[PDB]
Amino acid sequence: GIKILLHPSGVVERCMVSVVYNGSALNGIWLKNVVYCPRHVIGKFRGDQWTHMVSIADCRDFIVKCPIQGIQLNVQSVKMVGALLQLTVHTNNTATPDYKFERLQPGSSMTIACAYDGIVRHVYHVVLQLNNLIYASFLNGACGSVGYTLKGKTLYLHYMHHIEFNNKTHSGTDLEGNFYGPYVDEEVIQQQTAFQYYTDNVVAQLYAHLLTVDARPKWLAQSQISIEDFNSWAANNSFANFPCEQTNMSYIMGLSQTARVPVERILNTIIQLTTNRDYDFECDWTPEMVYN
């Protein structure tokens, strides 16, 4: 079949740690001799207050424990990198895999290991939207949970959670400490990029449907529209220019032949489904996930 595929959480689980600082509790990930947590564990600060506030943060106040290994770590030095804290601990993490800090481009998927008190409780799937937000599931104390990818032996760390916004959107940084989009870790109103559909992913879900359900749907458009004509329509209808990624073409072209529905018919179907749509989880299927 064709399912939403997630990456096994074993590697992440053994590196998760709790970070409690003067009654503020969140999660952190422990790689080599460094624990990465969100900087607001030391307090709710804004703008450029963070530098001075971190320098006065006492190291012995960082209560850091690793539940899977039953070890309590001790911080030797605190360094703010971007909007994250790099806590150097005396112990090297024996379970550290080959890892990489890789930034995501919007339209890409990743597995969230949502943790509490340093223990991964749930695992679910998200795609970074063109507004640079994920639509996730988080409660108090979940900051520090990471969104990751796996390729063989190597853990690809992509996301660390920081903020939940009023419309159940979620923002965070990469593991370098830089946020996705213009959002910051401050409890104030923050303007959001207007939503836009990652067209490549919408095309992937429609093909996934024609490959799993039995008969061609009656709402599948009968006439095809040119890619060029779709992109003129897309500019005025909150859809990203197609293709969003040139490398997705090989996948989409392969789906088009397995399903025997030209991509030009899929795009006209998207346009004709406009009355139905007039955010709603259509960009969760990436072309690579559907094709492989």
Place this chain on the structure above:
Amino acid sequence: GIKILLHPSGVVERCMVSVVYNGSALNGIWLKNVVYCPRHVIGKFRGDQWTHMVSIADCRDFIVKCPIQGIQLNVQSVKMVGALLQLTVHTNNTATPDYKFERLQPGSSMTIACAYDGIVRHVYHVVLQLNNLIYASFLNGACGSVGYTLKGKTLYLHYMHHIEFNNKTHSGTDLEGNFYGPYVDEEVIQQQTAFQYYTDNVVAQLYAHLLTVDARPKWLAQSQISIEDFNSWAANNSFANFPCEQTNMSYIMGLSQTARVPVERILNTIIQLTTNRDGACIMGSYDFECDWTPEMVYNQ
């Protein structure tokens, strides 16, 4: 947000093994001093040939390695239990969690730890359908992959994979060895009971939509239908009698209160959508899904 929640696979990853027998390779799970794997690793036998074939299977031809722990295990004795083999080994698994073999009733969900060569490659979510099949994702060598859930510390194993039927449906046994539904581990055409929706889960899907995507979608029915009237319609439209489980009613009444939409309107929306849908995308899907259970949508 309301999401499809999966159980962290780390416990299962530490117990997966590879089992290779004279050219046939699949996975197994290693709990205490026992390795459980599908029986067809020894051959593609039918009917009542299994008792004899297993009895004459050489314990030395069982190559059993646990990759994440670097161990290669050695098989002391083999014993068939249902359609599963129970391979006793010299070594105890120190990573063995507190576990329980629990059989699933239809309409309940589990996390599939999809494995190859003893390594979990993917992790996804399925629900046992009323045909006792799961709509999963498997290729060669995936047999022995398990379905599981977690209640805090205990590992609840429900499923082990055996078969793929051509409609991309999958079948297997519980960890006791007995299949779900009338399917068996043979490469023959096997009659499938016609598909029926798990109405509780379809109701949970539409409620998930009201609570995260759009509180008042244009396809939400305005009038309601009684549970009784729906069940009369359901008997002729491949929807199970509502409710399929009486215990879902506590969750369903809760979702109704927070969504302030009585489930009678949800049931009438199900009936209207079988003629009115026209490609509407509900909770991220273009058809009715049994993946959302009331408990998961309510608890989250």
